[PDB]
Amino acid sequence: SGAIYVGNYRVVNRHLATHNDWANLVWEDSSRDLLVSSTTAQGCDTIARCDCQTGVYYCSSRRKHYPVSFSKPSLIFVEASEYYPARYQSHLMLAVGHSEPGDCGGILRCQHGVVGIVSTGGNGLVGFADVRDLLWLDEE
Ligand SMILES: [Zn+2]
């Protein structure tokens, strides 16, 4: 589990979104596994605005933050998981590392802020849903 709290936005994995998230929906995209809902309280996370390919992610199933290199956001074929069939997922970045379903929502961060959240795992790879192209999170 996990979210990003920026401004009056909460960013979560679409497959972990709550009723309250859908009841306060701003934007959602199944192909990216993302959903954004509106918040009453201001959040303090900063979204990275950059093309970094190195950062650090939180892996809840190891209680550890791991430094990783990660790929550029792309349309990636993902094997079936407990929460999606095998499919193409868009705006996804891969690293070599551990990720199980409970790790979804863990933050990937670089020197500029939050890059994205864990979304995929298996075959020794971890996949992150990028948020750096969602420039509207920074405003309004
Ligand atoms: Zn960066």
Side-chain angles (χ1 to χ4, degrees), residues 16 26 31 34 37 43 45 47-48 58 61 63 66 68 71 73 90-91 93 104 107-108 115 118-119 122 131 140:
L16 298 177
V26 173
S31 84
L34 288 180
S37 59
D45 293 326
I47 307 300
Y58 184 61
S61 68
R63 295 185 192 147
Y66 293 103
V68 288
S71 63
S90 72
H91 297 264
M93 300 172 292
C104 286
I107 278 172
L108 174 64
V115 174
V118 175
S119 176
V131 298
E140 138 84 339

Short mmCIF file of all heavy atoms in Angstrom, two decimals, residues 16 26 31 34 37 43 45 47-48 58 61 63 66 68 71 73 90-91 93 104 107-108 115 118-119 122 131 140:
data_model
loop_
_atom_site.label_atom_id
_atom_site.label_comp_id
_atom_site.label_asym_id
_atom_site.label_seq_id
_atom_site.Cartn_x
_atom_site.Cartn_y
_atom_site.Cartn_z
N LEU A 16 -5.94 -0.24 -5.85
CA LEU A 16 -6.05 -0.10 -4.38
C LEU A 16 -6.95 1.09 -4.02
O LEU A 16 -7.04 1.41 -2.82
CB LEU A 16 -4.65 0.02 -3.76
CG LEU A 16 -3.75 -1.18 -3.99
CD1 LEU A 16 -2.37 -0.92 -3.40
CD2 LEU A 16 -4.38 -2.45 -3.41
N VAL A 26 -10.43 12.73 -9.24
CA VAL A 26 -9.91 13.77 -10.16
C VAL A 26 -9.60 13.15 -11.51
O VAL A 26 -9.97 13.72 -12.54
CB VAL A 26 -8.68 14.45 -9.56
CG1 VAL A 26 -7.99 15.39 -10.50
CG2 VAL A 26 -9.04 15.12 -8.26
N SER A 31 -4.78 1.78 -17.70
CA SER A 31 -3.57 1.38 -18.45
C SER A 31 -2.30 1.76 -17.66
O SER A 31 -1.30 1.06 -17.83
CB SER A 31 -3.55 1.93 -19.82
OG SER A 31 -3.07 3.24 -19.87
N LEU A 34 -3.10 4.04 -12.22
CA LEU A 34 -3.12 5.22 -11.33
C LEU A 34 -4.54 5.76 -11.14
O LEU A 34 -5.35 5.73 -12.10
CB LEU A 34 -2.27 6.32 -11.94
CG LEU A 34 -0.75 6.09 -11.89
CD1 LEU A 34 -0.03 7.29 -12.53
CD2 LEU A 34 -0.29 5.89 -10.45
N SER A 37 -7.29 11.28 -6.40
CA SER A 37 -8.49 11.81 -5.73
C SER A 37 -8.15 13.15 -5.07
O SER A 37 -6.96 13.52 -4.89
CB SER A 37 -9.05 10.86 -4.75
OG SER A 37 -8.15 10.51 -3.74
N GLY A 43 -1.13 18.33 1.04
CA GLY A 43 -0.02 17.39 1.19
C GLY A 43 1.28 18.09 0.95
O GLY A 43 1.28 19.20 0.41
N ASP A 45 4.26 16.23 -0.32
CA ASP A 45 5.22 15.56 -1.21
C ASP A 45 5.48 16.49 -2.40
O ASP A 45 4.57 17.23 -2.83
CB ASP A 45 4.69 14.21 -1.69
CG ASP A 45 4.56 13.17 -0.60
OD1 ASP A 45 5.37 13.18 0.31
OD2 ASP A 45 3.64 12.31 -0.66
N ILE A 47 6.57 16.33 -6.40
CA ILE A 47 6.72 15.43 -7.55
C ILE A 47 8.00 15.82 -8.27
O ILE A 47 8.25 17.02 -8.53
CB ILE A 47 5.54 15.53 -8.51
CG1 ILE A 47 4.19 15.33 -7.78
CG2 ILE A 47 5.71 14.58 -9.69
CD1 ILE A 47 4.08 13.99 -7.12
N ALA A 48 8.83 14.85 -8.59
CA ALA A 48 10.02 15.10 -9.42
C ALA A 48 9.60 15.59 -10.81
O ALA A 48 8.65 15.04 -11.40
CB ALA A 48 10.76 13.79 -9.56
N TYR A 58 11.00 2.31 -1.85
CA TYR A 58 10.63 1.60 -0.61
C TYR A 58 9.96 0.28 -0.96
O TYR A 58 8.95 0.24 -1.64
CB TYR A 58 9.73 2.41 0.30
CG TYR A 58 9.46 1.68 1.60
CD1 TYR A 58 10.50 1.37 2.42
CD2 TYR A 58 8.18 1.28 1.94
CE1 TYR A 58 10.29 0.64 3.58
CE2 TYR A 58 7.95 0.60 3.14
CZ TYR A 58 9.02 0.30 3.93
OH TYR A 58 8.85 -0.46 5.08
N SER A 61 7.81 -5.25 1.69
CA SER A 61 7.99 -6.71 1.96
C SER A 61 9.43 -6.99 2.38
O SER A 61 9.69 -8.17 2.77
CB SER A 61 7.60 -7.51 0.80
OG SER A 61 8.48 -7.32 -0.29
N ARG A 63 11.04 -4.27 4.29
CA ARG A 63 11.23 -3.12 5.22
C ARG A 63 12.54 -2.42 4.86
O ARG A 63 13.33 -2.06 5.75
CB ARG A 63 11.19 -3.59 6.68
CG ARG A 63 9.83 -4.14 7.09
CD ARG A 63 9.68 -4.52 8.55
NE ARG A 63 8.47 -5.30 8.89
CZ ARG A 63 8.40 -6.24 9.85
NH1 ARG A 63 9.46 -6.53 10.58
NH2 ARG A 63 7.27 -6.92 10.06
N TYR A 66 15.77 0.60 -1.36
CA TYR A 66 16.82 0.10 -2.26
C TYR A 66 17.15 1.15 -3.30
O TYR A 66 16.24 1.69 -3.97
CB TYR A 66 16.36 -1.12 -3.04
CG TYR A 66 16.14 -2.35 -2.20
CD1 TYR A 66 14.88 -2.79 -1.83
CD2 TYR A 66 17.22 -3.12 -1.79
CE1 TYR A 66 14.69 -3.95 -1.09
CE2 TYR A 66 17.05 -4.29 -1.05
CZ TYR A 66 15.78 -4.68 -0.69
OH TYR A 66 15.55 -5.82 0.05
N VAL A 68 18.20 2.06 -6.94
CA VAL A 68 17.97 1.36 -8.22
C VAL A 68 18.20 2.26 -9.38
O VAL A 68 18.00 3.48 -9.32
CB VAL A 68 16.55 0.79 -8.32
CG1 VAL A 68 16.34 -0.41 -7.42
CG2 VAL A 68 15.50 1.86 -8.10
N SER A 71 14.22 2.18 -15.84
CA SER A 71 14.08 2.46 -17.27
C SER A 71 13.20 3.69 -17.50
O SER A 71 12.53 4.20 -16.58
CB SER A 71 13.60 1.23 -18.03
OG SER A 71 12.29 0.82 -17.60
N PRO A 73 9.91 5.72 -18.80
CA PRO A 73 8.50 5.32 -18.80
C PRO A 73 8.05 4.82 -20.18
O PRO A 73 8.29 5.51 -21.16
CB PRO A 73 7.73 6.61 -18.48
CG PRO A 73 8.75 7.58 -17.96
CD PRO A 73 10.11 7.12 -18.41
N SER A 90 1.06 1.10 -19.48
CA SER A 90 1.71 2.30 -20.01
C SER A 90 2.39 3.10 -18.88
O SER A 90 2.06 2.96 -17.72
CB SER A 90 0.73 3.14 -20.80
OG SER A 90 -0.17 3.73 -19.91
N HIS A 91 3.32 3.95 -19.28
CA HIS A 91 4.06 4.88 -18.38
C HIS A 91 4.71 4.09 -17.24
O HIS A 91 4.71 4.58 -16.09
CB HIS A 91 3.09 5.96 -17.87
CG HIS A 91 2.55 6.82 -18.97
ND1 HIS A 91 3.09 8.04 -19.32
CD2 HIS A 91 1.51 6.61 -19.82
CE1 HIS A 91 2.39 8.55 -20.34
NE2 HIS A 91 1.44 7.70 -20.66
N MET A 93 8.05 1.99 -15.56
CA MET A 93 9.52 1.98 -15.51
C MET A 93 9.92 0.73 -14.75
O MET A 93 9.37 0.48 -13.69
CB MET A 93 10.00 3.22 -14.77
CG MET A 93 9.56 4.49 -15.44
SD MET A 93 9.93 5.95 -14.45
CE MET A 93 8.81 5.72 -13.08
N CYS A 104 2.96 -2.55 -3.70
CA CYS A 104 2.35 -1.48 -4.50
C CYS A 104 2.14 -0.27 -3.64
O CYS A 104 1.66 -0.37 -2.50
CB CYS A 104 1.05 -1.96 -5.14
SG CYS A 104 1.34 -3.07 -6.52
N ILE A 107 7.05 4.41 -2.57
CA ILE A 107 7.56 5.56 -3.35
C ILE A 107 8.93 5.23 -3.94
O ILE A 107 9.80 4.68 -3.26
CB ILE A 107 7.58 6.82 -2.46
CG1 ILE A 107 6.16 7.42 -2.46
CG2 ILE A 107 8.58 7.84 -2.94
CD1 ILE A 107 5.93 8.54 -1.50
N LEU A 108 9.09 5.64 -5.19
CA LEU A 108 10.40 5.79 -5.88
C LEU A 108 10.71 7.29 -5.83
O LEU A 108 9.89 8.07 -6.33
CB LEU A 108 10.29 5.28 -7.30
CG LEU A 108 11.52 5.49 -8.20
CD1 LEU A 108 12.73 4.71 -7.66
CD2 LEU A 108 11.22 5.08 -9.61
N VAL A 115 9.15 10.21 -7.98
CA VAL A 115 9.15 9.81 -9.40
C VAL A 115 7.88 9.02 -9.72
O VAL A 115 7.35 9.15 -10.84
CB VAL A 115 10.43 8.99 -9.68
CG1 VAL A 115 10.42 8.43 -11.07
CG2 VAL A 115 11.69 9.79 -9.39
N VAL A 118 5.40 2.02 -6.77
CA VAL A 118 5.44 0.60 -7.17
C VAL A 118 4.07 0.21 -7.72
O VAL A 118 3.03 0.50 -7.07
CB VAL A 118 5.84 -0.30 -6.02
CG1 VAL A 118 5.77 -1.76 -6.35
CG2 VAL A 118 7.23 0.05 -5.49
N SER A 119 4.08 -0.50 -8.82
CA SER A 119 2.84 -0.98 -9.48
C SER A 119 2.95 -2.43 -9.92
O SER A 119 1.85 -3.08 -10.03
CB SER A 119 2.51 -0.05 -10.60
OG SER A 119 1.36 -0.49 -11.36
N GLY A 122 7.51 -9.31 -9.84
CA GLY A 122 7.72 -10.68 -10.34
C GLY A 122 8.89 -10.77 -11.31
O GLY A 122 9.39 -9.76 -11.79
N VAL A 131 4.84 9.31 -12.44
CA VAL A 131 3.93 10.47 -12.24
C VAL A 131 4.59 11.77 -12.72
O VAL A 131 3.95 12.82 -12.62
CB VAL A 131 3.44 10.61 -10.80
CG1 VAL A 131 2.62 9.38 -10.40
CG2 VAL A 131 4.55 10.85 -9.82
N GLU A 140 -3.47 24.08 -8.83
CA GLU A 140 -4.96 24.07 -8.97
C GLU A 140 -5.58 23.02 -8.04
O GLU A 140 -6.76 22.76 -8.17
CB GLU A 140 -5.33 23.85 -10.45
CG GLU A 140 -6.48 22.89 -10.74
CD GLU A 140 -7.90 23.44 -10.67
OE1 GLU A 140 -8.13 24.49 -10.01
OE2 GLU A 140 -8.80 22.81 -11.27
#
